[PDB]
Structure formats: structure tokens, C-alpha cells
């Protein structure tokens, strides 16, 4: 009754930066070859989406944002083989073509078909399946799940379990997987180590879960909002410190607390200063610091290279280093096997119509993850 036809539905359009989302009707074109149309079930409010509003992350406007979601396939285009109509799926904001130099690498994950390095804000064929008021609406990261119906390329969606709580497992599309994978797959947190986590939101808490799951003896969470310490200690943080509660540079404090530096530090905020700070506080000869936060656009940090020369390892990662299409189904299947918990990340659950409310909440500090259930 809808396959092969234009679907008229509501979406959250962003016409310009630093303005709230306009909840209006959009025209969703039917899926083309190797494309998939998804009926959204639940979507998360990631800071990454807020970065598009604030101008921190630059992508073509106007746009339908969102990338943390899980829906059910409405219709598939010609040549789609990995998902069928009626399958539960998760949009992958990092694709997995399987044919490129990174996808074939056994330990690489930033597939080259991504729309992040140089945002084109379209499908793979370079066109927009979205229309609002007759104007075409750009895509976001190949997902654009801030809509009741979206279209993704087959490389940007994975099939998850048919018996999946779609209102929880949507966090596996981004927030949880990024933080958990950064700790387990990127940093490679060892048993008994000391970990520092800068930022205690959805991704930062997920990092903490990964470190505790990896057996970290100490997990020091850092945030300038102490209202976040409670949740952090719930999921594994052994101590929480507030840089504003220190007279000297936070890194010096953590060097003391760790008796010479932490084994693994994580920047999970998106500031240049914290990125260098988080690298500074890990052990100068065998420490590892992982950047997870998104920096401001086109904008450099200044850092003493002699901080690496002593033996430090500094690395970043997209989506926790997880190969998206291989891993997102494995994580959904692990979550239901009670391998880890997603519920500690969900603080608010709202109607999609109240999407500017869940965003106002993230900018005031009151939320970790606001799920939007369609």
C-alpha cells in the first residue's frame, strides 16, 4: 500500500543552524536500487546531532538529522540482499561496503563510503530522497532517522534480531557501541588498569561500561557537571572528579591520583583542550589515550610532541572501532544475552513530536539519552 510510492510523513527538518527543528510534512521517495526504506520505531538524541545545529559539525543544510535509530523495513529496492521487508534493522552511520581497502582490513572500520570526511549530505548516488515544501532536504551520515520514514543505502543498514526491544537496542547504532567499543576494541583495556574518562554522557558512560567489562581496577570519570557522577559510579566509575573543583590543571591531579598517570584515558567531550589534557594524564611511557569526541569544525589543537616521544599512544576512533554491519547485529544479539545493559543510558523517553524538548534537555545537562518512540 506504500511500496514504490511517495510516502508523505512527518520529519524533523533543520533549515539553518542554531534553530529548533521544524516538525512538518516531508515527501519520502521510494527506495531505488540497493536502497532500503525504513519505518522508524525509535531514535536517540545524540550530541552529534546537536553539533549539526550548533555549527560544531558542518554538513549541508537543510537536513533531516538523526543517526541513532532502529526501525522496520517498509520496502527494499532492486538488488538488496541483506534485509527484507518487515525485518528489524538499524541505520549504520558508518557504512560497510565490504569491497574497499578499509573494509577488507581486519582491523579497520571507517569505510570509505562514509559522508563524514567531506559531507555530501545525500545518498550514495548523490541525490536526496527527501522533499519538504518542494525543496530537497539533505541527508545526514547516510541515515537521517529524524523522520518517520527514511531511505538508506544497503551498506548503511544492518539486520538485527526479530525479537529485539527496538526502544533500547537503538543505542547500539551509536552511543553505546561507540563508548563500549572505544574501551574494549580501540583502547584494549587490560585487567587491573586505571582508566580516565573525560565526559560522562551516553558515550562516556558506555566507555565506563567497557572498562569495567574489560576488568579495569580504577575508572576515574571527569565532568564539569557533578550531576553526572551518580550514573557514572552506577555503571562502573570508582571515582569522579570535577576540573572546576581543582586549583591546578586537571591532568596534574589525575597524575597524582593514578600515582604517575592512567593506563587508558578517553576524551569523550569534543574539546581541543580536553583532548590534549586527556592525552597528558595517561602514563607517559605506556599510556594510551583515545579521542572519541567530535572537535569544532576546521580547528586545531596545539600539543607538545614530546608527550608522545616518551612512549604514549594516541589514537581516535569512529563508532568504537566496530565494523558496523558485522558488529551491530552481534551487539544486538549480545545485549539480549544479558552481556551488558542499555537501560542505564535511557533517562527520558518522549514522543517524536516533542523532539525539541529532548534536545533542550541535553543542552541543560539533565539527560543522558532521550529515546524518541514513533
Position 316 contacts a copy of itself (CB under 8 A): yes
With CB cut-offs between 5 and 8 Å by kind, which of a copy of itself, Zn ion, ligand NAI, none does residue 286 bind? a copy of itself
Q: How far is the CB of 317 from ligand CXF (least distance, A)?
A: 9
The CB-of-316 to a copy of itself minimum distance in angstroms stands at 3
- What is the C-alpha to C-alpha distance for residues 236 and 205, in angstroms, rounded to an integer? 8
The set of cell numbers assigned to 354 is 516533542
97 touches which of a copy of itself, Zn ion, Co ion, none (CB within 5 to 8 A by kind)? Answer: Zn ion
Which position among 28, 29, 38, 48 is part of the footprint of Co ion (CB under 5 A)?
48
**Is residue 200 a contact point for ligand CXF (CB under 6 A)?**
no
Q: Which does 270 bind (CB under 5 to 8 A by kind): Zn ion, ligand NAI, ligand CXF, none?
A: ligand NAI
Q: CA-based angle 53:374:330, to the nearest 5?
A: 85
Report the C-alpha gap between 32 and 151 in whole angstroms: 9
- What are the φ and ψ backbone dihedral angles of 356, each rounded to 5 degrees? -70, -20
CB of 85 to ligand CXF, least distance (A): 27
Could you say which DSSP state residue 283 is in?
-
CB burial string 52-83: b at 16+ within 10 A, e below: bbeebbebebbbbbbbbbbbbbbbbbeebeeb
- Residue 206 sits in the site that holds Co ion (CB under 5 A): no
CA distance 195 to 132: 47
d(CA 163, CA 157): 17
Q: How far is the CB of 341 from ligand CXF (least distance, A)?
A: 21
Binding to ligand NAI (CB under 6 A) within 173-202 occurs at 174-175, 178, 198-202
DSSP β-ladder status, 313-316 and 346-351? unpaired
Asked if 170 is part of the footprint of Co ion (rule: CB under 5 A), the reply reads no
C-alpha cell at 215: 576488568
Give the per-residue contact string, 67-106, with ligand CXF (x = CB under 6 A; - = no).
x-------------------------x-------------
C-alpha cell at 299: 580547528
* Binding-site member from 73, 157, 158, 318 for ligand CXF (CB under 6 A): 318
Which chain residues interact with ligand NAI by CB under 6 A? Answer: 46-48, 51, 174-175, 178, 198-204, 222-225, 228, 243, 268-271, 274, 292-294, 309, 318-319, 362, 365
Amino acid at each position: 500500500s506504500t511500496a514504490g510510492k511517495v510516502i508523505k510523513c512527518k520529519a524533523a527538518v533543520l533549515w539553518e543552524e542554531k534553530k529548533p527543528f521544524s516538525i512538518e510534512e516531508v515527501e519520502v521517495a521510494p527506495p531505488k536500487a540497493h536502497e532500503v526504506r525504513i519505518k522508524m520505531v525509535a531514535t536517540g538524541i545524540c550530541r552529534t546531532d546537536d553539533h549539526v545545529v550548533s555549527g560544531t559539525l558542518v554538513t549541508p543544510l537543510p537536513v533531516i538529522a538523526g543517526h541513532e535509530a532502529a526501525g522496520i523495513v517498509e520496502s527494499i529496492g532492486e538488488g538488496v540482499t541483506t534485509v527484507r521487508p518487515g525485518d528489524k534493522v538499524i541505520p549504520l552511520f558508518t557504512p560497510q561496503c565490504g569491497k574497499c581497502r578499509v573494509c577488507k582490513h581486519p582491523e579497520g572500520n571507517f569505510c570509505l563510503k562514509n559522508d563524514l570526511s567531506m559531507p555530501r549530505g545525500t545518498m550514495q548516488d548523490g541525490t536526496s530522497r527527501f522533499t519538504c515544501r518542494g525543496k530537497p532536504i539533505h541527508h545526514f551520515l547516510g541515515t537521517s532517522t529524524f523522520s518517520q520514514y527514511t531511505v538508506v543505502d544497503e551498506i548503511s543498514v544492518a539486520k538485527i534480531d526479530a525479537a529485539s526491544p527496538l526502544e533500547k537496542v537503538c543505542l547500539i547504532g551509536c552511543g553505546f557501541s561507540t563508548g563500549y567499543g572505544s574501551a574494549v576494541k580501540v583502547a584494549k583495556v587490560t585487567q587491573g588498569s586505571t582508566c580516565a574518562v573525560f565526559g560522562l554522557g551516553g558515550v562516556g558512560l558506555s566507555v565506563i561500561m567497557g572498562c569495567k567489562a574489560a576488568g579495569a581496577a580504577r575508572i576515574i570519570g571527569v565532568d564539569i557537571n557533578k550531576d553526572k557522577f551518580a550514573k557514572a559510579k552506577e555503571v562502573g566509575a570508582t571515582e569522579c572528579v570535577n576540573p572546576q573543583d581543582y586549583k591546578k590543571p586537571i591532568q596534574e591531579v589525575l597524575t597524582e591520583m593514578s600515582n604517575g598517570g592512567v593506563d587508558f584515558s578517553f576524551e569523550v567531550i569534543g574539546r581541543l583542550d580536553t583532548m590534549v589534557t586527556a592525552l597528558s594524564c595517561c602514563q607517559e611511557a605506556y599510556g594510551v589515550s583515545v579521542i572519541v569526541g567530535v572537535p569544532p569544525d576546521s580547528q586545531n589543537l596545539s600539543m607538545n610532541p614530546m608527550l608522545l616521544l616518551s612512549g604514549r599512544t594516541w589514537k581516535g576512533a569512529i563508532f568504537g572501532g566496530f565494523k558496523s554491519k558485522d558488529s551491530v547485529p552481534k551487539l544486538v544479539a549480545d545485549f539480549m544475552a544479558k552481556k551488558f545493559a542499555l537501560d542505564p543510558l535511557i533517562t527520558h523517553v518522549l514522543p517524536f513530536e516533542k523532539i525539541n524538548e529532548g534536545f533542550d534537555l541535553l543542552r541543560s545537562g539533565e539527560s543522558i539519552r532521550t529515546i524518541l518512540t514513533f
